[model samples]
Target: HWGYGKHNGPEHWHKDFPIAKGERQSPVDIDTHTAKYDPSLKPLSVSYDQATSLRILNNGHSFQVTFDDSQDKAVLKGGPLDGTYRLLQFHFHWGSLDGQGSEHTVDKKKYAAELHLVHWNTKYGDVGKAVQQPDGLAVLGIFLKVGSAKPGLQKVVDVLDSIKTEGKSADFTNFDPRGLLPESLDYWTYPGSLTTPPLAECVTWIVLKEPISVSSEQVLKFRKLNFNGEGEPEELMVDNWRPAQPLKNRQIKASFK
Candidate 1:
């Protein structure tokens, strides 16, 4: 792992970490003009009950909640087009140096941060196996902008004190991440790759059209987190996000319909 710097940052991180190069990098700016242009519409729908049963985890990178497909409490409903899948881990992406911290950029405009709501296919009984299927995963992407102060996100900020150092996670049990979801569900959908190393290409991304606002101070707090592992000073985790990647002939569709 390289220390925080311009050239040494995530963009070039793959150079040193070979497996990183295989990841299906995200936040690639979506330029409508260049997109092959499919007008198909995918409505936003989910099973609230099935979603709430997800298991949450603070994986040090960002707060992540995983859905145990094996859990009898998990359930899926409806058909492929209108079906609800089991809720799984959700996480965030931020920038390390740039003021923009989002994983996905729009028209090259970077936001302060982005959150991913990951779900698994019900067809498979296991999340691990489902992730290997072409349509096994669906990720909901929400962009976060730096605005006036927001009390809503403090629930997360407050917990940062507990994980002051990296690799330090407490029992974040019994919290509903659904509370963090943006009020608006309008989104854009498309086939995409995972935003991390060994970036899997089997994801269907549903990026929100509306963005949530957080204060500059809140963004500062997120940046205060250190990735230096235990006992390290609270180095800034502000811009731990990666730069946008090439579209590579992929098509993105919006729910504007």
Candidate 2:
């Protein structure tokens, strides 16, 4: 029912999900200069192996690569999180050909796409249990700049043809997510919510300052995906991202000076 159409877009989200207008919403505009440097913050650590990566699918919204969270095989630590957060899934959001698809903007500039690596706090059990609490999730927001093909994204790009339509899923194991990040770990940290619906305010967002590249070919591959289920009038799954939300009283802390 909630799609990124003119009738059901971000502007009208507050009507259905009141928390859409709540404090601590995500994908905020990062005014770099306004971020305060916090020396107390620590560099983030990501320990991952390919064994846990399971499947890739088009969920009528975005293409997601989910992982098995039964064990602590892949996780995020340090940075803004007080406890280890197990990797759950990763997805992307984008727009048309020109570079304007990202949810979080840098000085009001939207990148071609954005990558979200979703994780849940271990202390609260599974994602279902952790999603409602204050310190339950830590999501990594990595902006995707349009450039030459990145080996990391290329692996997924090679599989886009299989999931061209909605509700399509296929085996996607042995994927090392570390290659998706840029070398620089400099980041902007804040308390936020999920960009999509349910709009739960349970995330500790760590937006990386450095972006990895994705080719024009890769953007086309993602745009080719359909928002409608098979047999329905095909609708391209473009602009899946939400508009930047207000930071309100929250101050974005920077891990770097």
Candidate 3:
């Protein structure tokens, strides 16, 4: 029953999930000046198998595209990671209106939306066991700006009509997520946890420097989905983003000079 409501929002999350107050909470504000460039950091390698893409579902909080991670079909390598990380799924976070949505921000500047490609470190066996170790998970965060429509994202928007309510999903395949990425691979690396509850501090956060575009009209489509179930209260699923958490003792490393 936890959600973006006034009573159960990010501010109140720590009440139920004590780990929400952990030192390495994610979606921190990236102050460019403080993001030190690490020459040792290698370029990120992202390869996805369109065939591994299975379905798209709306879980009330947000919509996600699940992938068949049984094999190394879609994987992320290099960057701040040492081992191969398999793609589990990808989802997004957005605000109800314009000017705010993204989880991670630059100089306190929030974008219209943010995309997260969640992966698990193969060295740790699977996602469950991976979360127990510091370097168990790797999440790539890309900021989304509202401007011209993105052709790659249109396929996702078209399916929103079917999964208008929570727990609803439809088969979505042959989608190449690479088309949704920015041309530049420059990014910031940090140690952090998931932005939501059971906020496991195992993720190696790799947030891209460049942002991709989405349409103002397209964003409105996601809002048409609901926070509650179809038979439930029928609340709008907007503002599903967490506030920036503290940086604490962690360092934000930049791959670009």
Candidate 4:
């Protein structure tokens, strides 16, 4: 029952999940000027089969689009990753207003929203087992800016009404997750956690430097989602992002100069 509310927010999470205070916590502020440029980093290799997108669900914390990870139908390789990682699911985080929301900030500048595409290393077999080990997860983080209406995201937005309540879900397919990415795959990589409870320190964070565009209307649609279920008092699902954590001794690597 953890949430972004005052009582259950990130500040209180460490009481229940001690790992929240662990070194190398995610959603850290990326200081591009200080990040080391690693020429050794390879360009990201992404191959996603549209059919792999199975369903979308409102899991209270956020609305996520789950993919069929049984096979490597959708996978990511290269760019600080040691092995192939299968796509499990993707979700987003945002605020009630456009001024601030993204989990990771750039030089203390916050974005309108952020998107996370979660993947698990196939070497560990499955997400349940993989989550407990180091180098078991790889997440792609893309920042969202308020601009022109994104036709690519309209499909996802069109379905939001169907999953407005907690635990609500519907079949979702034929949507290529790649359509949401920005032109430049250039990014900053680091070792971090899930940004959510259990707060596992297993993810190889690949946060893109370029941000994608989304209209203000699209951003507002996400706020319409409810954290409460049917017949319960409706709680708006906004500002569902964890605050930026300390970088500790970790060094962020950049794929570009």
Best by lDDT: 4
Q: Taking the tens digit of each residue's C-alpha lDDT, what string does model 2 give over 15-118?
A: 88999989899879999889889999999988876338899999888999999998999999999789899999999999875569999999999999999999
Candidate order by lDDT, decreasing, is: 4, 3, 2, 1
Q: How high a TM-score does candidate 3 get?
A: 0.97
For residue 77, what is the lDDT in candidate 2?
Answer: 93
lDDT of 3: 0.91
Query: In terms of TM-score, which candidate is stronger, 3 or 4?
Result: 4
RMSD of 1: 3.7
Residue 94, model 2: lDDT of 92
lDDT of 1 by residue, 1-257 (tens): 45445756666666755635543445578665544324466456644553433333345456555554454343333222344566666677776543677878777778878888777776777668876877777777889888766565676676776665656665554545556667787666667767765466667777877888777777776776666566655555556666777666566666554
Model 4, residue 141: distance off in Å is 0.4
Report the C-alpha lDDT of model 4 over 37-79, residue by residue, as the tens digit: 9999999988875427889999999999988899878899988
TM-score of each: 0.80, 0.97, 0.97, 0.98
What overall lDDT goes with each candidate model? 0.64, 0.89, 0.91, 0.92
lDDT of 4 at 135: 92
RMSD of every candidate to native, in Å, equals 3.7, 1.1, 1.0, 0.9
Q: Model 2, 130: alpha-carbon shift in Å? A: 0.6
Highest TM-score against the true fold, candidate? 4
Worst 10 residues of 3 by lDDT: 45-54
Which residue pairs collide, candidate 4? none
Off by over 4 Å in 3: none
Candidate 1 vs. true structure, TM-score: 0.80
